[PDB]
Symmetry: C2
């Protein structure tokens, strides 16, 4: 069916909202989707299209220093990946409250998803919010302390700031609700081992009963039609 | 606020996006072609961005992609070049279908695409000087030579690409505004493809309508800057 999409201000910033046309004036199951680093909610808006076509409401915010928040300091942003990620985690409760205040959320049917930096965001949120319906992380990681040593390392940022969010001491929270981990097995940006290590830790700990882990052979750091279909099908089995 | 729908035209599924207030009105239209092994849904952010700018956007499936993909992953990898050639050939019928829907205002029609889709847009250009403007993002016009290195297709007659290859008809690329965008670290479609076309047009005195945009350090990926450049280009030429 037909979907509606709009840019709207919510919680003090700009979001992208998509939903079925026939449900603009109704609460719905909602997915917050977080975009990747140096990308934007508009570049990742195909997730909103695909999920709204499946009947969901999708809310896409701007990460710090991205989208309408970006002021052109490209070199500085390159040095602030990890503080940007940390602020992304911290902004989730206020965003949830703003969604609820709009009348957009049906009950407790709220999920969180993202790709790359956005998938890292989703996993960190999950450690603090296992009441969520379900979570998806595509070509991401939960091992922030480790990965911040090599991937876009941030000068003058204390790695201890990531302690509360890193998934190493939070695996039972990741096991509490349905979790999708997707990764291309040839990723040359976020190593596939980030996701393999998490899958193996959950399985070895008897914490994998709610885990869906999908690998795509030969795929690098890019979302494919198969990854998108996997994401939609996952939410159709838990959030719908 | 924009509206987006899937529509079935003559047995082919298309993605259509436009401003909600204009659903029942003709508009300037952009046909956007997706990349190889991708789909119109994965590239639908172009439809979102351009509809937010006031355009109607029509996105079809390439042969063996989207709703036309019915299996044979391995076979599809061997058929890049016949898929591209058939993508060129389908444009007139697609335009006729768009017009039959009442979607197109006059002759205000442009084509664009990324990767294989940008190749498609350039090939269409060579045969359609009546178009308003054309955009090719991280693509190439040098089909005959590129077919020997990028996803080569066995048992495909390369000579059938000669009628489409831009290097056999440089003046046709100069007839209308043309955007070439490329990331200079692209490891899938080499940036040299775009550099060589820009230089060929400049050396032929055929670059007066050419806009060439590079992004330093960017690989085979559409960035927010590339997307903004595409929107700004069509605003310049469809206004």
């Amino acid at each position: 069916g037909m979907i509606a999409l709009e840019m709207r201000n919510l919680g003090g910033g700009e979001i992208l909202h998509a939903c079925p046309q026939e449900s603009l004036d109704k609460p719905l199951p909602c997915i917050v989707f977080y975009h990747g680093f140096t990308s934007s909610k508009l570049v990742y808006s195909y997730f909103a299209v695909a999920l709204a076509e499946a009947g969901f409401r999708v809310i896409m915010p701007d990460a710090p220093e991205h989208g309408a928040r970006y002021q052109g300091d490209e070199a500085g942003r390159m040095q602030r990946f990890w503080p940007i990620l940390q602020q992304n985690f911290r902004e989730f409760p206020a965003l949830r409250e703003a969604i609820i205040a709009e009348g957009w959320l049906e009950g407790e049917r709220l999920a969180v998803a993202g790709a790359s930096m956005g998938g890292m965001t989703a996993l960190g949120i999950m450690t603090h919010h296992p009441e969520l319906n379900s979570v998806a992380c595509l070509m991401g990681s939960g091992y922030f302390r480790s990965l911040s040593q090599t991937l876009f390392p941030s000068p003058d940022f204390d790695v201890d700031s990531l302690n509360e969010w890193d998934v190493s001491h939070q695996l039972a929270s990741l096991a509490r609700r349905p979790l999708l981990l997707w990764h291309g097995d040839a990723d040359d940006v976020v190593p596939p081992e980030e996701t393999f290590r998490l899958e193996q830790a959950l399985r070895q700990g008897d914490l994998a009963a709610r885990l869906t882990c999908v690998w795509q052979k030969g795929v690098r750091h890019r979302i494919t039609p198969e990854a998108l279909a996997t994401t939609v099908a996952f939410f159709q089995q838990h959030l719908a």
